Design a protein around this ligand. Structure first.
Ligand code: DXT
Ligand code: C8E
Ligand code: NA
Ligand code: NA
Ligand code: NA
Ligand code: NA
Ligand code: NA
Ligand code: NA
Ligand code: NA
Ligand code: NA
Ligand code: NA
Lengths: 331, 331, 331, 331, 331, 331
């Protein structure tokens, strides 16, 4: 079977970097095509109760700030097995258990720049989509409880350039109308800024959907990092979202912010990021939606990494605002 | 729907560059696979009358002179809407209205090296394809008249590396067997050769198809560009093609030429290009065609761009001829 | 038609190179996803008896030691014709007649590192999947005898940087349970190490498949090469594999070895390669297999090329072992 | 040692019950004196590392709606032992682990009538203070994690009229500025409405205090109850509070509501309760506070218990509003 | 601060009721422990000029004619504030301003049965120490004049069973050795005998203390009440006491009497009460006193309340005499 | 002065009555908190040689089988005088001379159910703690001999409902290691079962304490009773306890028994009670003890009193055993 997500977003960005040439370059209107086509299937092996599953999902066709064309298998690509008793194991390229909760619902509408990759910490906060990974998903135990857990190889280790590795786990309980989310993921042997890093990171969150039409999510993310020279770093963040849905409309209000980083007990001044964004969405068909979106990004003013040299953050390009309309179609 | 254009051309090229190694390198026989797979669809959104359309077309799988593999969305990739009253808006990656007429019919068979990207002018004449584009195609008004019109972001602006942008427009009138073709396209903030350019380019052309089997096309392309230091450049060109069609055959004769370039009123001698070409085509099936073809390109001898350094042209590799057969199948 | 081959292998590698960072980088476990998706079709052109065929094969989605994503047409991608009379001629990117026999059956249980690209000879032994190629496959005449024959452009020549080329032929006679097969491939105009080479390469082998469950194969590969300054180089190699099949199981043991290289009559010390391997394979479905395998590679101790610089060989990463399980599914 | 809590609250109540005679009775102004005197001590037993501890806390001296005078040991009155390693176990009359979190912070600006005893469920949701109880408090593991756990005798069983019993547990993790609260308490052998009941009940909650002066708490209470004649009942509720604290002032907003009760799958119409309340507090001394408070109570319209007879609820007296000033002194 | 009044009175009573069973029951010797323990304090709130005050005074531990045990806060229990400028306001449970003059000095020795609660009138004459009260005491203006004034809720309204309330005022002028005392108190919404009453009560009195050792007190009490059916009742009374004090001794003679009641102008015969009493007192310590006292009580002969049923008065137990010794120690 | 006795006993009871609901209610584990707080003091009156003493003792805070809270003055509460000459006279609520010897040492461990308030005799065997009482405690004459003597009003007489009363005396001579004890107490005007009774009760006992660690007590109780209609009743009883003391431990074994009741010379069948008990006690601090104890009660089978209605005994609840640990702490 072929399956696509058609995804077009027209988006004007107004950057304030302090350099007007850079501002005019980086800013302006663009088209962010995140449409993608993939293939997936299941197959009942003649000698195996677990059902064989496989999927190859290609990448974003023409993202903004980037060129055209995407190969196959740039997104979730894997083989695996599934039995209803014990769930589903996958091997390949997937979302770590924590990254799932960081993305949804914690990065939407457009908070990603700060809650997804918006970090000031060293090492490697967590991992989003990693290609050398085993991941088991538990069933909905009692139709209420589920565990997600995964181990995999590191970014550099997947190309034979290093020995980073990682594991992570998260669980979700759905108490009636609410849902509780907790998550952990640890990285080790992370080589960066001239030292070797160990990252531990924990996430707590909640989600609810009530008949009055209000829905919400809120999350606390605690990020630690310890360097090989004995340096310690700690930074934490939050994301939460308020939405009302009436008829074929959803209004949404989102806020996310990473807070100031502490290195070796001392705090690093003005190293936090904050994002507010508003979104209206129209349920134009059971299979697609239209949306308009505006956002305000206030980014950090800098952090030297442990190498006497700067460290890159989402705010390294500078503050900006963005108004956008888009479409997303599922098939 | 999945749709392909399967397209193979075996083509021997005999280069005369002035360097025998260079001739031996660039020349010889090659296979030009222009096959492509694409995906496109329409969807009637339940709460919106204009029908949604989308298409993701992959690139040339193994071009000649190139390596293998191309992603999806390397060719026409877009989403859009269409209503019978006001036409068709598509957003993403499409062909500018002028490039449409440059490719068809003005650049085939083998007139492309000269009419398509074969320029001697500075700045950026017009655009082939380009992402970050909105394009409106008008209906066939009165079953005689049609407008094509579009604006989009520039090459560097699409990576936040500049503020190039452009707009363009074209029209078509149908007098019986004739069709009149006019088109315009202007580019702004084109950063090149150390200056900033504004390229205006104007095109008029005609097309005919007669019951006896005679068909023809002819076009005038007028190209202007102004660099930020007050320099001006102007160059003009033409392409025309004659074909008679009998039975399961079309013989064709094509000629295109860029003329000498004028910079600041002075003509820069031997900056012109011209190609002659012949092609026999057999309609081997309703769904496919075979062709044999031969062409001769004589290219310019060079011109420094406004940076005291050379300027790249389609002729920078030197004059060459090419004999080729190919197949093309549509599915 | 869509036809993927889904293939995942989890494989631990323990290297002994003499540098432990190298061991730690290069070694460890990784996920080698060799899944690939393709498109193929046939079409009867109404005005041409030979049947039209075409195929577009995508690359490996996330191989080990490599990043994610592969375009379409990275593997066997071609157009061609087929008649019961004269067989099948194809144009595009295919496998040379010899590389087919080097892959099957001679690298079967992981022996490729030594028998496939495991080379020490200079220039270019042969070609693994080459673009710009015409290749004719003969029918199975008398249902016992078949010819494979092809020529194509060289690797450097396909980018207009040279005029290297190659041709090759192989034959297969099927003496009852055995199959006797021989093959040749010659490359010309190969630029390397500061000179130009002509590589001649001959391979003979046999394979059998028996009702007892015994099946076996053995091949000898003879590789000669001559450089532009008058140097001669020769290396030879062999591969064999034994397999017993009970029920839904296959046991396999494979061995392959390149022997020491002779340059200008003088043999060069400690230049052999040898790989030993065992694998258990389970036929979990007619369309899929499970397998576990472990192998031991002993590689060369080094070789200066004719440019006084080293030559890369499969052993430039060092001796290493690997234990692995995988899955493979065909649709 | 003697210790007191001095506590005076002047409070006018405006009742709407539908009977004005009853309205004038229950309504009007009163003084709710919750002052109390207690005694506690520790003593290091000559032969015992665990420190003997004991406390006798008398009751509210003159509550509103009640007579004067209170004995000793009407509030938390107990003996127990404490070691720093494993915490402190107490025996006597204490707060169940879940009830603590209902009193604080969940019933905080005057919501108790709704979240504390504001119930519609049958049986016995949880327990206030029970004077036949063993309760263990964990240390602050890592000065971050704490477990509280207890079992005890029931209300009727403490008088030799029954065999009620109960157990409960809760935990609290302090993630930097946050605190997460979870809690459970189950009662058994509850004789009521002519049947024997089993109540299971779970609580989720969160707490934060940030430099900007914001503080908050939010809680979900899930209450189930099963009668021995096979009836099932389910009800749930929530409490949350938002407060800003500037200088010597705290503004506070609290909202709590029980939702409609479900009995045997069927919902009981208009059986929910809702309370809104606002409070200003002045930190008149490190040891005491003055406060003003106003609140709005909307109660259920009734529920028959499983005995064909009415069931008493916190709302059985009817809706009312309340404005109040008070003082509370600690010594 | 802990403060007690230790108080024991051994008192034999000889009752004359007309029934020897009642006489033998009600009479005999008894121990009247009026000891009580209290807790009280003042505190200067750091952010408030008025000084905070509070007191919790327990009840009589074993009164005569009563069971053992008394809570805390059964007597004067309150919180309040004081500044030298405007006096002292207390909130909680206190003595009404008239009751103070009724108890001291008008009811001792043993005149309470007649002057304190001994009324014969319907409704509610006044209040003996009622909770739910605010009370303001003025400074000694000009070091001669003092006013006391307070309002609070009624008895039934203090339990939400009605809406009775009351107010009252008293003043004190000090003419040399004299003090003139006047006081008023009115009660409203008094539910009794099936009607609702409004009772107003006015009191005038004087006290003197002379250098030669003579002291005296005399008071007139005027008691009104109006029932809701239009009935009116009026009764009046007096109490006076003379005492001479020499050395460590005070001899005292007390007389008090309720007079005949008038209902609707018509006086009801034999409804008066009067008591005669003598007491010798020895000052055994600055902190304590011993006393012997004998008193003789003659009570009224009865009256139906407006409910056709008899009405309870201090005399419903019948006439009696009483001889007693006691001790009183203050700490 | 403040003084406390903190006393907690965890005690499981297993009842056997002949009805298992009663067994289930009454039985089970409970927390019996017998902690109590008191206040006492002495004062030398400046004009009086006898030293003034006073005490206010509160009741048990949460007994087993009973609710929370106890007032002040439920236990020994009195005023009195003390001189070295004549000892100590106290007035108020104290323990009668006989109840002391019945409580200590004859009732513990756990023998009270049978020896203290256990009983079958009519009227009122004796009085436990009585209010309205004067009791003279004699000095220890010759440092070996002492008298205790007291009279007070009866239980019903203390509320003016009767004229029951009582007096009593006991003496103790201390012959070396032994102490010989005799005691009497008589009650009069006891109304019960429709008759008036005079109860006579005599007790003799011994006590010993040796350096060997052996200590023991034995006591015989003789109870007679005569009713107003001329009936006679007689019951007698005995208690003894043997204890050995090693180090900080005390072993104790206790037995007590009421014998069958004799009414009017005829014995009433199966009316005896006997209880046996064992306890281990640990002297964990000079002011505190830990103890475990188990005991077995076999109670009488019933007795109609002189009203043809049943008579209540300690066995009206049925036979039972009890296992328990407790704590006891002083001041
Ligand atoms: C030379 C090989 C090599 C050298 C050094 C490091 C490597 O990792 C490799 C490979 O893994 C190769 C392959 O796997 C091939 O894809 C490979 O194994 C292969 C195949 N599966 O048939 C090919 O035909 C090759 N390709 C598709 C054109 C290619 C090899 O050329 C290389
Ligand atoms: C101080 C003493 O004087 C007090 C005066 O206040 C009297 C209150 O007036 C009563 C009003 O209602 C009376 C209706 O008969
Ligand atoms: Na831009
Ligand atoms: Na899951
Ligand atoms: Na590795
Ligand atoms: Na058009
Ligand atoms: Na073949
Ligand atoms: Na705790
Ligand atoms: Na009494
Ligand atoms: Na006063
Ligand atoms: Na009221």
């Amino acid at each position: 079977e072929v399956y696509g997500i058609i995804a077009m977003q027209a988006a004007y960005r107004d950057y304030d970097s302090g350099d007007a040439k850079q501002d005019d370059n980086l800013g302006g209107m663009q088209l962010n095509n995140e449409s993608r086509i993939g293939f997936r299937g299941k197959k009942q092996f003649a000698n195996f109760e677990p059902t064989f599953i496989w999927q190859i999902e290609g990448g974003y066709v023409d993202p903004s700030f980037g060129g055209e064309g995407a190969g196959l298998g740039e997104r979730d690509t894997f083989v695996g097995f599934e039995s209803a008793s014990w769930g589903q194991v996958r091997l390949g390229r997937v979302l770590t258990p924590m990254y799932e909760l960081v993305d949804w619902p914690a990065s939407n509408p457009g908070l990603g720049d700060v809650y997804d990759w918006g970090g000031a910490i060293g090492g490697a906060k967590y991992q989003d989509r990693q290609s050398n990974t085993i991941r088991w998903d538990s069933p909905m135990y009692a139709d209420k409880f589920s565990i997600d857990a995964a181990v995999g190889a590191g970014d550099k280790a997947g190309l034979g350039a290093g020995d980073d590795y990682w594991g992570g786990i998260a669980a979700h309980y759905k108490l009636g109308p609410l849902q509780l989310d907790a998550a952990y993921e640890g990285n080790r042997n992370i080589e960066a800024e001239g030292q070797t890093w160990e990252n531990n990171t924990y996430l707590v969150g909640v989600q609810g959907w009530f008949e009055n039409g209000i829905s919400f999510f809120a999350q606390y993310k605690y990020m630690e990092a310890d360097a090989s020279n004995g340096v310690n770093e700690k930074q934490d963040a939050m994301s939460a979202g308020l939405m009302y849905t009436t008829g074929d409309w959803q209004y949404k209000l989102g806020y996310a912010a990473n807070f100031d980083l502490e290195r070796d007990g001392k705090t690093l001044s003005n190293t936090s990021d904050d994002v507010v964004s508003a979104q209206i969405m129209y349920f134009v068909d059971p299979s697609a939606v239209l949306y308009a979106r505006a956002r305000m990004n206030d980014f950090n003013e800098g952090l030297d990494g442990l190498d006497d040299a700067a460290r890159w953050t989402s705010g390294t390009n500078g503050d900006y605002n963005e108004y956008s309309v888009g479409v997303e179609y599922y098939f």
